[PDB]
């Protein structure tokens, strides 16, 4: 980046990797049918939505990783916690 280099401190792979990780956190088992299912796609789009929201705060390396990771742990806790009340 000569004069245009905002995103440089983050690679595309980082974002896509984390976004898939976010999706994977929500649903780890890669089902070949569900993979081609719209409902999963909505969730994947939701993960990108998260990426968009984070980006403003994410104006620093540590912030960016922490934002995504923290939410993932939150999400994982939610599932286990609520399922505790099953039956």
């Amino acid at each position: 980046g000569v004069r245009k280099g905002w995103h440089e401190h983050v690679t595309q792979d980082l974002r896509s990797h984390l976004v898939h990780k976010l999706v994977q956190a929500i649903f780890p088992t890669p089902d070949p049918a569900a993979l081609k299912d719209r409902r999963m796609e909505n969730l994947v789009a939701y993960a990108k939505k998260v990426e968009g929201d984070m980006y403003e705060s994410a104006n620093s390396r540590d912030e960016y990783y922490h934002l995504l990771a923290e939410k993932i742990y939150k999400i994982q806790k939610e599932l286990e916690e609520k399922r505790r009340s099953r039956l």
């Binding site: 929500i26 939150k74 939610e78």
Partner: peptide
């Protein structure tokens, strides 16, 4: 509020699904 935490319905999907 872009939804940093996932709403119930999306979360339900994984709970309802079991390979």
């Amino acid at each position: 509020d872009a939804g940093n935490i996932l709403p119930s319905d999306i979360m339900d999907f994984v709970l309802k699904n079991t390979p």
